[PDB]
Design a binder for these strands. Structure first.
Ligand SMILES: O=C(O)c1cn(CC2(n3ccc4cccnc43)CCCC2)cc(O)c1=O
Ligand SMILES: [Mg+2]
Ligand SMILES: [Mg+2]
Ligand SMILES: [Mg+2]
Ligand SMILES: [Mg+2]
Ligand SMILES: [Mg+2]
Ligand SMILES: [Mg+2]
Lengths: 249, 745, 705
RNA sequence: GACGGACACA
RNA sequence: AGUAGUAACAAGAGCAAUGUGUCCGUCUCGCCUCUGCUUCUGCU
């Protein structure tokens, strides 16, 4: 509970080049040297995926796959191979190993997809219980205006919600700022209660909280209702010459 | 019957079928080989449109510098760079008078952003000219190399972490008489290819230490590197673009931030707005200029473009503009913003890769770089390049050409926009006080100009007044690309207005298809592109359903994930067939697992795992969204909550493809080691500061001091709360003492 | 001063003081008395916290040497590090954050301590610092050089021994600030700008960045700062020559000329595969072993032909070695006869090396190892030679717009329709599929997709080999039966592609029934062999036609292969246009116009020119014509087409503004014609589009007669 | 916040 | 020869993808060349 990382830091400061980096680079300069790179960079990822999936092992994954997925399939397909390097902890994976996991891997009782992506399930519940009217044909007069694509929380702005997120997920990292609104205090209290003993990683919890609390706005051509439940089905309810009558669930 | 598609324009108006004029299903033009010819072309053209100006020899670099400002007024309609300082100052003063408080507000916002901007803002760039390598690098790599050379030569103000202190270091670094930099050198080795049995040159990239003299360092700090713009549509011929180094980018950032704050509050600026907001702005200026009219008043729109916009802008005019906009501001702020026009006035353009040369008698080719092109005898160049070399020889310094006039492609977009908007602002009827008046919108060189008047001769006089004023400030309207008609239809940057903006779907054609990230991300990208184009680009519902079908076909080919009941056979048909057979509810299987396409028009906004979730088998759902997902990355659990890892959320189709950074016959381990050591240091930092990937941590203390302070306070809090014993606490504090002792030694 | 501070203080205190001053952005010279004050404050903060421990029970031990300190020192830490400490302490308990950074935290009392040091009065400095810290749960403690303390309400949480030691230290420091002379200023300093100057090299650069009537940067800044305009623009416009004008020329398309098309030899065919002249060898409902694998499909399609004879050259490639092409066909045939495994790799023979350009590049060397070569000349950069428009490309475009008997695009299935708009879209989409899927341009789409896919997979997986790649399409017939078609073969060359534009050379060998000797300028790059005879049964009389093989070296790159694989997006560009026309009438009639557009046969759209004049066709013919236009934009993509489409769009818009009665004008119509005709060089599709524009212009002028 | 893609102008 | 088109490829460093702006998606690992790893390409 804190001794592992300090022993690792001692092992790194034993190296002189690592010590020179860690003592001469400040926290501000770590944002620079984190994005440092020196090799040539590969462009055109769509073309590269077109010819890479004709290969046998386009996927790279951790060495832990060697304990989790068998080397060969029942059909005879080799599911993974060791990398070209001499002593890396990495493998090259066939897409048959992804298919092997999805048909015969270990079945977990708990999954985290409906909690984390609850906003999309709410969109789906509004669509599944939606009511369609008739389509009327006439000339649609669309005014380009700023509407909400994500309503956020009613009591917060986007910046207030971002401060709420930093308080809920990373409370020792917020620095000098304080939650200057009782809405921020109540929503921070509620979300800190909801997320006790969370197995989900903190960056995923932060993005989940961004999808819940933060309002996003966009400039869109709008013919009718400008509410956020109607902006998400804008492709469905309006076109150039037609209007689909729709009430969300 | 010989079929002619253009005869559909006999019935359908041109804007309503404008997609049939954009051939965007074919490959765009790419250049081959070097961009040195286009660089010399731009340098020749820039010095030719300014040729009646004053020549000077720069005392600090030795370069020949052409000054066309306040030169002779033009006598023809050719492109001129003879901008008059007083006419620019009158236009900027009139723009200030028409918008009271605009310059003060924008300058104070720029002042508030200067004091808060960190150095790593300069890592927003793409391929930067790296002066330490004399070569292009990514922006963070070039910034890190510049900061390391600055700290090795005693320039340590940038250790505060603010961008303005780095800029002070940049300006102070020009007093150095001998800069010592780390360069790359190659050792060459002749070996045999074991496969092809052929003697090839093997290359190993090392690190060397070289000295730059004061003049050579100053020439490199003022260098813009150049290359050809690839995949550009709508042109027969190519042109060069430019990339500046890190000594210029920080100043250009603050100048463009001031100009963005001005442009954001001007009704006649088309920047920084874009997309639907730019269309709303153009529609508002059309509706306003067609309201303000009597029954006896004509309205005419110029669909306008300018000839050689970046080559006729001048850094001295930008200097006068920045000093006028900041009049009444603190002199540190005025002097800081004046640096980027002064640097562009003394800029040199790096000529590029050189040319390829060929011996027919020895059957060899060799690239001769831009450093070595000056020592090549003239008779070996071809005819056009011999002409270009001859009229460039007095400009050539150290593999670069001097280029005092011009701003190069897109270096000061918002400031040249402000100049054009000042000319558009001149035509208010209360100020102009004649029979004509004008209005419109400008973004970069593109403009719409609405001229109103009582007679057509008033329209001609207004067009002449606008055109000659633009000529006075170095703006040359393209006569062969501009046209005029009555207000009601125009074009602006491939937005076609015909009593309203029409759709141009063909421009969105290169975005349809499989994106090549992984199976899951590409599924979301494809359905979102179809949804966005239904909303914005008037993609009809039948064509949207066909877009869904074509995307699913291309997707099932690419990841070889055809349906489980297919007669096809790929490398993974047997495993997908096994999954298909034992699955009870096959409608819950994802498309990457051989399942059906669930998408129609109504559910394009719902992701694929959520849309199929209620139809999944429990075993398939437990496998697919297994939190022990071996294909995705797992964060370690921190110290405020073999080893503990967090549960995964993403499905097993969120794998990462393998990467290939390798260069032919090249060993780059000696330069790829630094990136790996950096990534190890930044990985050990995030074990102490878990929000470091979410939000960038700030601080002037070193990484080690921060990690030791966090370790000590974490151990004390965990001891005070009963998570660790006193033995663990004393162990951690003695470990921090040992790390401090190793730091001192 | 500073050496006073460096002599009277410790190393650690001085280091933390200098680090604090460096963090705020000053030095121990510009504020030296403040450096002494910072070192004094740091010394007092350390003397508050030295030797103060808390036991394993919960009570303090004031030691003098496994115990934990009583105080967390927040002073002297970096600001973000200090706020990390303060947030961690405030979240261990539930106490409120202080709005300012304190100096200490006491773990025994659990209180944030603020240490002050003053030279005025302890009472008034205490009142002023409590005015600063109003409304917090802090604990202030003020020392002075008088030797006096004042805490919060005199409820002291530090013992009298260490407080006496701190007072003794401050009294001694006062009595040492007088034994040198530096004291009366220290009592008067209680409680900043932004500099940015030019160093002299950059100041000399700034003096050379001016308008040429100025010599110093500050003189020009003083000129700009005091500028008042006085009609400078009006005076310069009066003095500017009146040849500078944007004189408007009235645009009337009845008086404008046609585009000049270039002269020279005829344009030749440059598609990567044969189009209208292509011949299929098909298998109906394929069920052979290895079905689906391309070379097994190719052998099954080659088995359907039984009329092979000895191949003879009947039309030479005038620049090539044509016997090499004949030998390449003989080698390919014999190797298909005896192939093992899944893929066929050809032995690199001399004729096959010639056809694939092996060893044609000069060997790349470094210029260090090349300076003494006496004949190193630069690579040439010649423009393309002009070509005349030939009539074959219009025939190709007529055939591409036509319906075939086979279904060429197999669309994948959709999700079920629930919304009424999805039922309407399905109704319209079935008409679109009934027009688009049987078009010849759809066959060209599927041919290009298959060829570019196979060439890209072979170029990346078999880079050293000479792979044989069958030209395969698959269709369904009228009765829904599957059919697999072979059009010939491609022999790929070496493919070590590093740049985006890097060419892989290949050889195409394509079956045809078209005699090349009847239109020979179309076939300039080809060597056509006669390889067989085939019985063709018509309604006139069945005959024996010769089967020809069109052989040529061609080359492609990865960007061309990428855009050839994406050619099904051509189907979008057509149908979105067609649907938008159906939508526009649907907005007027207030009902769905899909079924009256596709059922009421009327010939309602100009798409053609016969000798009788402008020809009209249905909305389905318009679908197929726009599809063939997109397909031919993809097959014959070039920079000439980009430049031509861009610059002739302006002329189309000027014609449209004339017909809208919007009174259009130009400033330089001749220069626009030169920009359009600069792009019409030798590409047959660009030449056909320039001809099509001339025909549209003539039709517009005739509609104004 | 980081990485990627598409478009537009320079 | 052929691709192509203002200069290249036709193997032997890919040392040549900017600025500004809009829209959209994703989320911390991988990458390494004498070799060390794989021989792959099937769109009814
Ligand atoms: O900043 C603090 O924590 C702090 C600062 N002082 C003011 C002084 N000081 C110390 C660092 C510093 C930085 C900027 C301005 N004044 C600063 C201390 C001596 C000279 C002035 C007094 C306290 O009692 C504090 O607790
Ligand atoms: Mg222009
Ligand atoms: Mg333009
Ligand atoms: Mg303090
Ligand atoms: Mg204090
Ligand atoms: Mg992009
Ligand atoms: Mg040639």
């Amino acid at each position: 509970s804190g001794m592992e990382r300090i022993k690792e830091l001692m092992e790194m400061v034993k190296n002189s080049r690592m010590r020179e980096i860690l003592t001469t680079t400040s926290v501000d300069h770590m944002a620079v040297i984190k994005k440092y790179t020196s090799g040539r960079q590969e462009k055109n990822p769509a073309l590269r995926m077109k010819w890479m999936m004709a290969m046998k092992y386009p996927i790279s994954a951790s060495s832990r796959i060697r304990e989790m997925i068998p080397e060969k399939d029942e059909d005879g397909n080799t599911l993974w191979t060791n990398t070209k390097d001499a002593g890396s902890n990495r493998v090259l994976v066939s897409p048959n190993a992804v298919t092997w996991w999805n048909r015969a891997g270990p079945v977990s009782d708990v999954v985290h997809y409906p909690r984390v992506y609850k906003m999309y399930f709410d969109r789906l519940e509004r669509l599944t219980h939606g009511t369609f009217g008739p389509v009327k044909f006439y000339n649609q007069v669309k005014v380009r205006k700023r509407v909400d694509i994500n309503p956020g929380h009613k009591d917060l702005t986007s910046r207030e919600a971002q401060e709420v997120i930093m308080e809920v997920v990373f409370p020792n990292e917020v620095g000098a700022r304080t939650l200057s609104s009782d809405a921020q205090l109540t929503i921070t209290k509620e979300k800190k209660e909801e997320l006790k003993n969370c197995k989900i990683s903190p960056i995923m919890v932060a993005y989940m909280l961004e999808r819940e609390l933060v309002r996003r706005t966009r400039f869109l051509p709008i013919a009718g209702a400008t509410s956020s439940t109607y902006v998400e089905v804008l492709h469905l309810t309006q076109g150039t010459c037609w209007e689909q009558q729709y009430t969300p669930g | 019957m010989d079929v002619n598609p253009m005869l559909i324009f006999l019935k359908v108006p041109v804007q309503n079928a404008i997609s049939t004029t954009f051939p965007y299903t074919g490959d765009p033009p790419y250049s081959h080989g070097t961009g040195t010819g286009y660089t010399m072309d731009t340098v020749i053209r820039t010095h030719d449109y300014s040729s009646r100006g004053i020549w000077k020899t720069n005392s600090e670099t030795g370069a020949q510098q052409l000054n066309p400002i306040d030169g002779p007024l033009p006598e023809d309609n050719e492109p001129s760079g003879y901008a008059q300082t007083d006419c620019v100052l009158e236009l900027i003063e009139g723009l200030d008078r028409s918008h009271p408080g605009l310059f003060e507000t924008a300058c104070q916002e720029t002042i508030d952003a200067i004091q808060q901007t960190r150095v790593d803002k300069l890592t927003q760039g793409r391929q930067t000219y790296d002066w330490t390598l004399n070569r292009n690098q990514p922006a963070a790599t070039a910034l890190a190399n510049t900061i390391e050379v600055f700290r090795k030569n005693g320039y340590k103000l940038n250790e505060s972490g603010r961008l303005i202190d780095f800029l002070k270091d940049v300006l102070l670094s020009f007093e150095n008489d001998s800069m010592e930099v780390t360069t790359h050198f190659q050792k060459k080795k002749r070996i045999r290819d074991n496969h092809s049995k052929k003697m090839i040159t093997q290359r190993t990239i090392g690190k060397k230490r070289v000295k730059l003299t004061k003049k050579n360092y100053l020439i490199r700090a003022l260098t813009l590197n150049t290359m050809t713009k690839d995949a550009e549509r709508g042109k027969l011929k190519r042109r060069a673009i430019a990339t500046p180094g890190m000594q210029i980018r920080g100043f250009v950032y603050f100048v463009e931030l001031l100009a963005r704050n001005i442009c954001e509050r001007l009704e006649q600026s088309g920047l920084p707005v874009g997309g639907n907001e730019k269309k709303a702005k153009l529609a508002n200026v059309i509706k306003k200029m067609m309201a303000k009219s009597t029954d006896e008043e004509l309205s005419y729109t110029i669909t306008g473009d300018n000839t050689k916009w970046n080559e006729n802008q001048n850094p001295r005019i930008f200097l006068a503009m920045v000093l006028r906009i900041t009049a009444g501001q603190p002199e540190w702020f005025r002097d800081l913003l004046a640096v980027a026009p002064i640097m562009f006035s003394n800029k040199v353009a790096r000529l590029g890769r050189g040319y390829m040369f060929e011996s027919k008698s020895m059957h060899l080719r060799t690239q001769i770089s831009a450093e070595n092109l000056s020592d090549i005898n003239l008779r070996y160049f071809n005819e056009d390049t011999k002409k270009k070399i001859e009229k460039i020889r007095h400009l050539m310094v150290e593999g670069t050409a001097s280029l005092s006039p011009g701003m190069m492609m897109g270096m000061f977009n918002m400031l040249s926009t402000v100049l054009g908007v000042s000319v558009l602002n001149l035509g208010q009827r209360e100020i102009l006080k004649r029979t004509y008046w004008w209005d419109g919108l400008q973004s970069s060189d593109d403009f719409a100009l609405i001229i109103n008047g009582h007679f057509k001769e008033d329209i001609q006089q207004g067009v002449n007044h606008f055109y000659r004023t633009c000529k006075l400030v170095g703006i040359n309207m393209s006569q062969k690309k501009s046209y005029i008609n009555k207000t009601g239809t125009f074009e602006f940057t491939s937005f076609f207005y015909r009593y309203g903006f029409v759709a141009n779907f063909s421009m969105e054609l290169p975005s349809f298809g499989v994106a090549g990230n992984n199976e899951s991300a590409d599924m979301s990208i494809g359905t979102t592109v179809i949804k966005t184009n239904m909303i914005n680009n008037d993609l009809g519902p039948a064509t949207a359903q066909m877009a869904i079908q074509l995307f699913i076909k291309d997707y099932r080919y690419t990841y070889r994930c055809h349906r489980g009941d297919t007669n096809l056979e790929t490398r993974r048909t047997k495993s997908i067939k096994r999954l298909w057979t034992e699955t009870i509810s096959k409608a819950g299987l994802l498309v990457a697992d051989g399942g059906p396409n669930p998408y129609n028009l109504r559910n394009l906004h719902i992701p694929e795992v959520c849309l199929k979730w209620s139809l999944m088998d429990p075993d398939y759902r437990g496998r697919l969204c297994n939190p022990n997902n071996p294909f995705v990355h797992h964060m370690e659990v921190e110290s405020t909550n073999k080893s503990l890892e967090y549960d995964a959320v993403a499905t097993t189709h969120s794998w990462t493809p393998k990467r290939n950074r390798s260069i032919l016959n090249t060993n780059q381990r000696g330069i790829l080691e630094d990136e790996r050591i950096y990534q190890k240091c930044c990985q050990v930092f995030e074990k102490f500061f878990p929000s470091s990937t979410y939000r960038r941590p700030i601080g002037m203390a070193s990484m080690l001091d921060a990690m030791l302070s966090r370790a000590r306070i974490d151990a004390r809090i965990d001891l005070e709360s009963g998570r660790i014993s006193s033995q663990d606490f004393s162990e951690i504090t003695n470990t921090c003492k040992a790390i401090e002792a190793l730091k001192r030694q | 001063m500073e050496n006073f501070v460096r002599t009277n203080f410790n190393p650690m205190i001085l280091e933390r003081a200098e680090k604090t001053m460096k963090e705020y952005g000053e030095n121990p010279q510009n504020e030296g008395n403040k450096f002494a004050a910072i070192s004094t404050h740091m010394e007092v903060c350390f003397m508050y916290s030295d030797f103060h421990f808390i036991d394993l029970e919960g009570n303090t031990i004031v030691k003098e040497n496994m115990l934990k300190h009583r105080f967390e020192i927040i002073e002297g830490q970096e600001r973000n590090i200090a706020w990390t400490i303060v947030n961690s302490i405030c979240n261990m308990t539930e106490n409120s954050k202080p709005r300012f950074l304190p100096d200490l935290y006491d773990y025994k009392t659990n209180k944030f301590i603020e240490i002050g040091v003053t030279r005025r009065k302890v009472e008034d400095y205490y009142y002023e610092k409590a005015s600063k810290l109003k409304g917090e749960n802090v604990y202030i403690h003020i020392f002075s050089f008088d030797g006096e303390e004042m805490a919060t309400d005199d409820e002291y949480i530090l013992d009298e021994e260490s407080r006496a030691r701190i007072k003794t230290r401050l009294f001694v420091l006062r009595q040492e600030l007088a034994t040198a002379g530096l004291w009366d200023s220290f009592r008067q300093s209680e409680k900043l700008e932004e500099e940015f100057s030019y160093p002299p090299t950059f100041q000399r650069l700034a003096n050379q960045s001016l308008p040429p009537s100025f010599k110093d940067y500050h003189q020009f800044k003083a000129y700009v700062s005091s500028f008042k305009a006085n009609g400078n623009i009006e005076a310069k416009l009066g003095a500017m020559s009146e040849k500078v004008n944007a004189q408007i020329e009235s645009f009337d398309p009845r008086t404008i000329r046609e585009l000049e098309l270039p002269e020279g030899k005829f344009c030749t065919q440059r598609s990567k595969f044969l189009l209208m002249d292509a011949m299929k060898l098909s298998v109906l409902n394929p069920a052979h072993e290895g079905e689906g694998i391309p070379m097994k499909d190719a052998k099954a399609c080659l088995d359907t032909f039984w009329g092979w004879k000895k191949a003879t050259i009947i039309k030479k490639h005038e620049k090539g070695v044509n016997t090499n092409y004949l030998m390449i066909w003989e080698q390919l045939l014999e190797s298909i006869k005896e192939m093992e495994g899944k893929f066929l790799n050809l032995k690199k023979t001399n004729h096959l090396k010639w056809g694939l350009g092996e060893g044609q590049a000069p060997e790349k060397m470094d210029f260090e190892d090349c300076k003494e070569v006496p004949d190193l000349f630069q690579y040439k950069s010649e423009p393309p030679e002009k070509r005349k428009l030939a009539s074959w490309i219009q025939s190709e475009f007529n055939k591409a717009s036509e319906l075939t008997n086979s279904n060429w695009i197999e669309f994948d299935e959709l999700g079920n329709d629930v919304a009424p708009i999805e039922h309407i879209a399905s109704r319209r989409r079935n008409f679109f599929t009934a027009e688009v899927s049987q078009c010849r341009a759809s066959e060209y789409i599927m041919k290009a997709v298959y060829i570019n896919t196979a060439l890209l997979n072979s170029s990346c997986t078999a880079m050293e080999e000479y792979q044989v790649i069958p030209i395969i399409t698959k269709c369904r017939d009228t009765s829904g039966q599957r059919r697999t078609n072979l059009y010939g073969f491609i022999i790929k060359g070496r493919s070590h592609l590093r740049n985006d534009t890097d060419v892989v050379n290949f050889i195409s060998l394509e079956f045809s029934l078209t005699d090349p000797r009847n239109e020979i300028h179309k076939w300039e790059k080809y060597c056509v062999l006669e390889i067989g005879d085939m019985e063709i049964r018509t309604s006139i009389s069945t005959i024996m036609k010769p089967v020809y093989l069109y052989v040529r070296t061609n080359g492609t790159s990865k960007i061309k292969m990428k855009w050839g694989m994406e050619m099904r997006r051509c189907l979008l560009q057509s149908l979105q246009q067609v649907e938008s026309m159906i939508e526009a009438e649907s907005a007027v009639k207030e009902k769905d116009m899909t079924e009256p557009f596709f059922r009421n046969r009327e010939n309602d759209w100009p798409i053609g020119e016969s000798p009788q004049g402008i020809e009209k066709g249905t909305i389905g013919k318009v679908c197929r014509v726009l599809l063939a236009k997109s397909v031919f934009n993809s097959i014959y993509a070039s920079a000439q087409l980009e430049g031509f489409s861009a610059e002739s769009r302006k002329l189309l818009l000027l014609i449209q503004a004339f017909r809208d009665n919007l009174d259009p004008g130009t400033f330089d119509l001749k220069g626009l014609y030169e920009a359009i005709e600069e792009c019409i060089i030798n590409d047959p599709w660009v030449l056909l589009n320039a001809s099509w524009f001339n025909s549209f212009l003539k039709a517009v002028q005739l509609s104004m007669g």
